[PDB]
Amino acid sequence: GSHSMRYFYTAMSRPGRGEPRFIAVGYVDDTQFVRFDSDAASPRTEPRAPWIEQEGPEYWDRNTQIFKTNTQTYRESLRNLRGYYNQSEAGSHIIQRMYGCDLGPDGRLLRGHDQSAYDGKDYIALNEDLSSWTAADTAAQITQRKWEAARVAEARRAYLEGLCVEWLRRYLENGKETLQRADPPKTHVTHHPVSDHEATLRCWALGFYPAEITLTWQRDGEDQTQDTELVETRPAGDRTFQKWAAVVVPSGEEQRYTCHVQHEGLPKPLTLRWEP
């Protein structure tokens, strides 16, 4: 199938409570595999999935140096951004970055990503061409000029098309038994009356990986988007995810309702009904 790798950086100021905390986590698809936390007793890159443990000390030291240097630069960046928005030194602020590469089913580069946010709003993003930037406001334009002057995009491109793809392929191979295994949802439908004349039908999907899934109710074959209660896909803690969709139906009309499930792990999309 298709696969992606992403690093997620969070730098958070906290005036009066020390220097800004920097965390970095790395993912392949929905699997975290590394973390670094400047607040750890002894800050260093730590493995978070078994298939990455085989990497040698050189790998871990390389990662740690990268994250330590970034820790320092992000503190400078926070200072710079507080100034770009004329903000007081009293408040706490957050820069976030997420970046990485997507591979198609044949293992070739589909596209790269490098996006940043400040206090939870789009700030600056590398365009799909990996050569130009989109700045969200006049502050991000200052960053854009600075990054253009320094040929930053060129460096991001070289990484996204080069090492990012190369290492993602390495991890996909080393962790093939899990990273390249899709586990289908285990599904069922529950029924409980809400009153004399109405009942809830709930369609469950459990144990699936990756998280991407489609779960819908149909009445007489028509989508019931508006009347369906759909919870956010949620992690079980064993790598897998869970989700349900519920609809309230007129007692007796249960068989007019069908639940449809699409997931990568499924050969054909499933259709389910309540089975008394």
Partner: peptide, 13 residues
């Protein structure tokens, strides 16, 4: 692997 450091200094925002 995360983005490696450049030869020079890392460019801040």
């Amino acid at each position: 692997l995360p983005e490696p450091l450049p030869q020079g200094q890392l460019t801040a925002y």
